[PDB]
Design an enzyme around this catalytic site. Structure first.
Site, PDB file in Angstrom:
ATOM      1  N   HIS A  41       3.444   0.747  -8.675  1.00 50.35           N
ATOM      2  CA  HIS A  41       2.902   1.376  -7.480  1.00 50.35           C
ATOM      3  C   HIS A  41       2.149   2.655  -7.850  1.00 50.35           C
ATOM      4  CE1 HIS A  41       2.812   1.669  -3.144  1.00 50.35           C
ATOM      5  NE2 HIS A  41       3.281   2.904  -3.168  1.00 50.35           N
ATOM      6  N   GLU A  73       5.228  -3.646  -7.354  1.00 48.81           N
ATOM      7  CA  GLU A  73       5.203  -2.621  -6.322  1.00 48.81           C
ATOM      8  C   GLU A  73       6.589  -2.009  -6.089  1.00 48.81           C
ATOM      9  OE1 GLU A  73       2.549  -1.323  -5.053  1.00 48.81           O
ATOM     10  OE2 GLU A  73       0.922  -2.760  -4.946  1.00 48.81           O
ATOM     11  N   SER A  98      -1.433   3.290  -0.910  1.00 46.26           N
ATOM     12  CA  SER A  98      -0.060   3.377  -0.375  1.00 46.26           C
ATOM     13  C   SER A  98      -0.122   3.927   1.061  1.00 46.26           C
ATOM     14  CB  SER A  98       0.846   4.185  -1.335  1.00 46.26           C
ATOM     15  OG  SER A  98       2.224   4.057  -1.035  1.00 46.26           O
TER      16      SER A  98
HETATM   17  P1  LIG Z   1       3.073   5.434  -1.215  1.00 45.93           P
HETATM   18  C1  LIG Z   1       4.769   4.995  -0.815  1.00 45.93           C
HETATM   19  O1  LIG Z   1       2.544   6.462  -0.271  1.00 45.93           O
HETATM   20  O2  LIG Z   1       3.156   6.058  -2.715  1.00 45.93           O
HETATM   21  C2  LIG Z   1       2.635   7.269  -3.724  1.00 45.93           C
HETATM   22  C3  LIG Z   1       1.109   7.525  -3.661  1.00 45.93           C
HETATM   23  C4  LIG Z   1       3.137   7.221  -5.180  1.00 45.93           C
HETATM   24  C5  LIG Z   1       3.337   8.636  -5.693  1.00 45.93           C
HETATM   25  C6  LIG Z   1       2.102   6.480  -6.028  1.00 45.93           C
HETATM   26  C7  LIG Z   1       4.482   6.502  -5.261  1.00 45.93           C
END
Ligand SMILES: *[P@](C)(=O)O[C@H](C)C(C)(C)C
Ligand SMILES: *[C@@H]1O[C@H](CO)[C@@H](O[C@@H]2O[C@H](CO)[C@@H](O)[C@H](O)[C@H]2NC(C)=O)[C@H](O)[C@H]1NC(C)=O
Ligand SMILES: *[C@@H]1O[C@H](CO[C@@H]2O[C@@H](C)[C@@H](O)[C@@H](O)[C@@H]2O)[C@@H](O)[C@H](O)[C@H]1NC(C)=O
Ligand SMILES: *[P@](C)(=O)O[C@H](C)C(C)(C)C
Ligand SMILES: [Cl-]
Ligand SMILES: [Cl-]
Lengths: 532, 532
Positions: free
Chosen positions: B437, B324, B197
């Site tokens: 995600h 996602e 991410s």
């Molecule tokens: P991305 C938007 O940085 O997401 C993080 C790691 C999660 C907590 C998995 C949504």
């Protein structure tokens, strides 16, 4: 005498014509207007002055002056649409087929030919009214109207060339039917107007125009609707094209009076020879001289009329063919030819998209391309060819018709929608073209009942089924026979949006005809274009 | 002693940790920068001053100051992402897991946590490096970096708060690994950076930034790419949000010096409490303090860098999960809730579309809606819910990543693409959310090898397969074992665009990941928005 009829215009003598081992009466080439010749060129039609003696109505009339297709000389697929009688500006005549013995007060159907407003004839073999009149026991009329510049040259503000005169030719023929059809055994209160392509657009235009509404009872529209993008232009655009025609013929352009006078001196063929030069864009499915939104025949814009219910409220039956685009791609787009499978390269796809949506800016073209490209398989020549067929068909025929049906159905008294998808066993055009623009007409007119024409048994049955839907609809406002056991053609409603297919297989009911693409053509693209 | 390592910064003592019936060495909480506290808040990191004596590296460090998710108190699905140690601005530490006996010169993998640049911790159970280090015999490092305003408040032109300092924290940890990993038995010439991410975006940003490129060998990006719409802002937008933060805290706003001084006086929680108030739009999947396109860390726009090949040319392995979007819809969009199937009305769909594409004008919103609505079945609550998942996933993760992969592959030395689509048997989130995600991370880190965690046998096997792809890739630039009989993960090429799925079923190769939608997101929509 069964062949002698007295009318308000004078006496007419018809002819006994053989039909399917029987006979009926035909009254061919009856005049309904004064010859629109000389100083009457471009002017509104005048009622035909009554005659003494007996009008000989035994033979087909002249066809109106028009562009003649010479793209495939001798080929029946194309030549079947060309004038088959001498061309003349003296061409405002109608034809009537009457059951034998003469009926008393029977349903009347009036055919309005298509041809993109630049061509067409009432006399085509494919419009022979005898089979339908005989089989379904209707009085079948075919009218005519001026096409091309003779019918549609528009110099708004002028009374000499006001525009829409071909639509007024059609109305005058309807007026004559209203006034005289009773003498042929027709009921003037049960007249159905029906037409295909430009004739279908025309039918819709008579539904809309206050000055036409009272002259018929109900309506059938085949592959055409009044709001089609090719079917009308603004008064400014009509004026521009009329002046551009004058420029092509080296006319004095200083006033309407000078321009019209120059144009009236020209031989008809002189106008026809330069007709295609006045189009504003490099395009397909666009025609030079078409109905004009004049504030008279059409009091306001077509969209505002449809939105406010400013139209005749009655029953309608209408629909489209599977491959509405292929005819125009064949004639007008690179990569398409009569004698090959016409697999389309990515490059010819792009050229095709541009020709198909000539009014779009580059963003609009990108929108269309994205909507119709399979990006998992973008070099597929069949998919590209079929994609273009859909673009042209959806944009020019299916989506305008769907927009019409949904607007109409909100105020109307009953809508029946069809999707004609039978490829005729004896079709002379290549297989890639599929179910072509215009190729339901032969089924509507009962040609598959004629042994010598080599249709299959199932095709005869399909034709009988169609003729019976159309005529029962004309009779009652409903294509279904009351209390028959056959499967029913359901009413199209705003809520369920049902339609039927028309082919040799058992009828199926479907819903929401091409709804995904029609939201693109009817809602999204116009918004995109208006913003950018 | 295996647990004693001398580094250029001083001696460190680690701890023996049990792992899967064996043991390895862990060095936890090693400092790599000076504490960025007091007047050092918002400033570039400073190298850690060397220490005398033995640094106690037996326990996890503090986590950086961050927003803490309290949306579902006590729920493991959400709390597994929250800091599990005390929060402190004194948080710039790294963790190293080392095989036993100590290797000589082995492959190194450096983990960069995600959390939208506003949160994240190196210490999460799900990032426990022991299983991967043990199983695949790599030296596994996890770094940390300042998040939120502490890492990303940007007042371009100021040297006190220049922006990007969290990315510079990451670079300084990479510098320390470069300089010192050899003493832990790591090979500094074979370092793979990997992250998910925002950590995946970060990995891409180090690929791009000239000042980072030399510090690692190759790269893995999970559900993140440097060009993601949430991953950076302009210097003007960064400035606007910094001033808006000051406004929320009643700061003197007359100069950068006055603003920074006010912001430095505040307790960390004071900043965090108003952090979300500075966003310019009503949005989901947008975060307040993120990397800034500064002309230094990023010399030009990300798009021009990618187009011109201005980036490190090496091998990359990257990919995305099936769903996602669902995490952010659950938290941020009406109609979505944890304990229902979240069937979505047409009205909540529209609200969702607007939240998902907050930068779009009304035409753009119409474009998105048309692209993702099944107009044959538009009131289907499941389809609307799934449509929104796709919109959010495609726009924020999948399509930016696909754009990155296609640009990178033109200049790079080998690309491997995956699509992770296994829903874990023990997932605590509702079924509607699908393959969420972040939920591949547990497979990458080998949690399914732990008996007590209740994964299936097939899930353990999937985890072993993934760990082996990732580590073999880190070792060689290719996830495939040379001369093994198992089915091969093919190279992604511009021409054939192949990728594999990752699930418990036999591997399949696919092509052109979400290509249709990504042409919309990457080509059409940006053009539409730039025109209108
Ligand atoms: P991305 C938007 O940085 O997401 C993080 C790691 C999660 C907590 C998995 C949504
Ligand atoms: C990655 O880079 C290497 C080295 O630049 C490439 O290998 C070379 O490829 C050329 C063309 O086939 C050969 O002439 C050289 O002999 C190769 N060198 C070596 C050391 O093998 C390789 O093709 C690149 N790989 C990809 C997937 O782009
Ligand atoms: C190293 O540290 C080990 C664990 O320490 C614990 O955490 C730190 C922050 C302190 O709070 C301490 O009181 C805790 O026990 C110790 O077990 C170990 O003895 C230490 N070793 C040396 C040599 O100091
Ligand atoms: P429309 C464009 O008026 O078409 C005519 C009738 C045909 C000859 C069938 C293409
Ligand atoms: Cl076909
Ligand atoms: Cl799902």
């Amino acid at each position: 005498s069964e062949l002698l009829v007295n009318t308000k215009s004078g006496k007419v003598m018809g002819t006994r014509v053989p039909v399917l081992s029987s006979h009926i009466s035909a009254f061919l080439g009856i005049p309904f207007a004064e010859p629109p010749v000389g100083n009457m060129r471009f002017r509104r039609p005048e009622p035909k002055k009554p005659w003494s003696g007996v009008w000989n109505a035994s033979t087909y009339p002249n066809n109106c002056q028009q562009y003649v297709d010479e793209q495939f000389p001798g080929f029946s697929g194309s030549e079947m649409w060309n004038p088959n009688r001498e061309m003349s500006e003296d061409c405002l005549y109608l034809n009537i087929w009457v059951p034998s013995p003469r009926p008393k007060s029977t349903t009347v159907m009036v055919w309005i030919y298509g041809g993109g407003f630049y061509s067409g004839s009432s006399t085509l073999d494919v419009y022979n009214g005898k089979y339908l009149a005989y089989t379904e026991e209707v009085v079948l009329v075919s009218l005519s109207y001026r096409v091309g510049a003779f019918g549609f040259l528009a110099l708004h503000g002028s009374q000499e060339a006001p525009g829409n005169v071909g639509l007024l030719d059609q109305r005058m023929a309807l007026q004559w039917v209203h006034d005289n059809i009773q003498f042929f055994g027709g009921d003037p209160k049960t007249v159905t107007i029906f037409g295909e392509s430009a004739g279908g657009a025309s039918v819709g235009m008579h539904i809309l125009s206050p000055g036409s509404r009272d002259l018929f009872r109900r309506a059938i529209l085949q592959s055409g609707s009044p709001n089609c993008p090719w079917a009308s232009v603004s008064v400014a655009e009509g004026r521009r094209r009329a002046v551009e025609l004058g420029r092509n013929l080296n006319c004095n352009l200083n006033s309407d009076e000078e321009l019209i006078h120059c144009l009236r001196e020209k031989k008809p063929q002189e106008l026809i020879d330069v007709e295609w030069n006045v189009l504003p864009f490099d395009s397909i499915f666009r025609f030079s001289f078409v109905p004009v939104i004049d504030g008279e025949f059409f009091p306001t814009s077509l969209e505002s009329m449809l939105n406010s219910g400013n139209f005749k409220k009655t029953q309608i039956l209408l629909g489209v063919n599977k491959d509405e685009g292929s005819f125009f791609l064949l004639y007008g787009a690179p990569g398409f030819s009569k004698d090959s499978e016409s697999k389309i390269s990515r490059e010819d796809f792009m050229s095709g998209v541009k020709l198909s949506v000539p009014h779009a800016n580059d963003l609009g073209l990108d929108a269309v391309t994205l909507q119709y490209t399979d990006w998992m398989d973008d070099n597929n020549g069949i998919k590209n060819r079929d994609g273009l067929d859909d673009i042209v068909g959806d944009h020019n025929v299916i989506c305008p018709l769907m927009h019409f049906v949904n607007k109409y159905t909100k105020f109307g008294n009953g809508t029946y929608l069809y999707f004609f998808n039978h490829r005729a066993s004896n079709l002379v055009w290549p297989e890639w073209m599929g179910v072509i623009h215009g190729y339901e007409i032969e089924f509507v007119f009962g040609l598959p009942l004629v042994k010598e024409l080599n249709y299959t048994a199932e095709e005869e049955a399909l034709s009988r089924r169609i003729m019976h839907y159309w005529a029962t609809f004309a009779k009652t406002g409903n294509p279904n026979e009351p209390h028959s056991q056959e499967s029913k053609w359901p009413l199209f409603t705003t809520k369920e949006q049902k339609f039927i297919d028309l082919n040799t297989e058992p009828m199926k009911v479907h819903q929401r005809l091409r709804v995904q693409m029609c939201v693109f053509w009817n809602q999204f693209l116009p918004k995109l274009l208006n913003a950018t």
